[PDB]
Each structure stands twice: as structure tokens, then as C-alpha cells.
Amino acid sequence: MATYYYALASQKFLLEEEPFEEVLKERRRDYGEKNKEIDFWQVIQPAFLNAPELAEAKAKAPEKNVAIVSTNKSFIVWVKLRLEYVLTGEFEAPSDAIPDPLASLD
């Protein structure tokens, strides 16, 4: 089990943040160049939001949502400061409630 950190946005909002998405693309590409295991992901309509421990987040969330997830806390701190209009939190996985931290509900 690992701790995952997240920043949850609306799909609408994240579509207005193209420079941000370019930063994430460049970060993936840089990781590959450095032979660093990818430890951050963008998850459309994340299934983790259904976990009981995330009930407060789900109650606040956009209808069509998307998370930036990482096992690197400092990366999510940056994401929050860069995007601002996101809900943040953390969870442990795999668990009964979150068997796949990267699963989409779509």
C-alpha cells in the first residue's frame, strides 16, 4: 500500500489550462529521458472518489471531474499552487474501497 495525493478539477476547468497540460506532457517525456518511473497520472472521472473516506470531496466535486494523482506529495503541492481551483487530498491504496487508484468510472 502507498499514499496517493490528488488534485481534483472539473473537466471544464482543466480544458482551460493547456499550458499546465503541456507541463505534464513535458514531465512525462523528461521522466522517460531520465529512466524515472512515472509516479503521476491524470485520471478522468476517478473511481477513488467513491471511497467512503473521500465522501466530503465527492460532495463538493464537479459532475464531470478529473484528477491529477501522484505518490509524490510535493508534486501535488505544486499542482495546487499552479491551478488553485482544485480540491486536494490523499488516500491509501490499494484498499477494498480503492482497489485501483488510477481507475476511471467511464
UniProtKB/Swiss-Prot annotation:
Belongs to the ycf54 family. This is Ycf54-like protein. It comes from Synechocystis sp. (strain ATCC 27184 / PCC 6803 / Kazusa). The chain holds residues 28 to 133 of 133 of the full protein.
